[PDB]
Scaffold this active site. Sequence first.
Site, PDB file in Angstrom:
ATOM      1  N   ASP A 105       0.874  -1.145   0.000  1.00  0.00           N
ATOM      2  CA  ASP A 105       0.000   0.000   0.000  1.00  0.00           C
ATOM      3  C   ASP A 105       0.922   1.207   0.000  1.00  0.00           C
ATOM      4  O   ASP A 105       1.442   1.593   1.050  1.00  0.00           O
ATOM      5  CB  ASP A 105      -0.897   0.014   1.253  1.00  0.00           C
ATOM      6  CG  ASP A 105      -1.848   1.201   1.275  1.00  0.00           C
ATOM      7  OD1 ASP A 105      -1.687   2.086   0.440  1.00  0.00           O
ATOM      8  OD2 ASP A 105      -2.772   1.235   2.104  1.00  0.00           O
TER       9      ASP A 105
ATOM     10  N   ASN B 274      -8.542   1.435  -3.529  1.00  0.00           N
ATOM     11  CA  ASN B 274      -9.096   1.947  -2.267  1.00  0.00           C
ATOM     12  C   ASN B 274     -10.364   2.597  -2.722  1.00  0.00           C
ATOM     13  O   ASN B 274     -10.366   3.301  -3.706  1.00  0.00           O
ATOM     14  CB  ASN B 274      -8.124   2.994  -1.684  1.00  0.00           C
ATOM     15  CG  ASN B 274      -8.586   3.619  -0.370  1.00  0.00           C
ATOM     16  OD1 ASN B 274      -8.215   4.758  -0.094  1.00  0.00           O
ATOM     17  ND2 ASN B 274      -9.251   2.862   0.483  1.00  0.00           N
TER      18      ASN B 274
HETATM   19 MG   LIG Z   1      -4.054   3.245   2.490  1.00  0.00          MG
END
Ligand SMILES: [Mg+2]
Length: 335
Positions: A216, A273
């Site tokens: 991430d 996301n």
């Molecule tokens: Mg994140």
Amino acid sequence: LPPRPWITLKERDLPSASFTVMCYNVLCDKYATRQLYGYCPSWALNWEYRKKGIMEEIVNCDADIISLQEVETEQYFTLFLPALKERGYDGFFSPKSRAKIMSEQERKHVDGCAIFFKTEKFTLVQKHTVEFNQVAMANSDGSEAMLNRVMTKDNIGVAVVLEVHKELFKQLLIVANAHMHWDPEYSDVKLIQTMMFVSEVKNILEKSIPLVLCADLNSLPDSGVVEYLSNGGVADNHKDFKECLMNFSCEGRITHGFQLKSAYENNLMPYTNYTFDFKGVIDYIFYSKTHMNVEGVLGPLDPQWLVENNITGCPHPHIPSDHFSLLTQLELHPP
Ligand SMILES: [Mg+2]
Ligand SMILES: [Mg+2]
């Protein structure tokens, strides 16, 4: 909830091994708040509820290699590791903030990064944690910014050196998993953390082995972070930076010797996301294009299903994290 569609990118097989890699941010309990996710009911945010869906996602992907972010310390040990052992994985976990002083209670809730691997296919040779704050401090060489902005950020990456069993095709693989600072106003930190991770992984490498890099990155595909990983370097005056930088080079350019490709390059997921305020690709699986090919990826959740269900942000009673998992099948050729 319809299972996600496999995209074949290239046919199998020369002698080579096939394996699958999952990268998934589970959303830790600490940050799953009504303040951040006011569109998801509290009963659906609750960890006792959400952890079921997260474990289900991981089980269903059935990856040979799993890289998780936002794994809470006490959950690694009482949930993620025991359950994944039952499926024949071993794991390595490291939390953020180990040098910070805090209560025993607080220590249980600190999150970090975990790598799991199927013990039938892999044997762990070494495990490492990379503390970005320490590497920043050690290389600040009279840069106030390195010290003020970079060192004060508590983010980590973990990396494991694995021996890939012969009977899948002595042969080594490094898997690295990191989770970079979040703040949109901190592109310089995100980029420096990525540069520090990669140079630190390179040191691990001596002591050449193919790399799978899961993270991430909190960075979109058009960022300095992604340009750096994808093109093998960046200009030392990239706008994302807004001398000590060469400490991570390995002339105008910071350089790395990996030759990496995103498994999901050219927009195969429209986002990774998914929230009311922000939808974008910020999670990545990168691999040494010298050693490996991509055979296929798990494609996006059927978008019509989300409009059918009026789902404008995650998590949701049926989607237990604000990030979607990444799942890739890779083909490794020995030297
Ligand atoms: Mg994140
Ligand atoms: Mg998060």
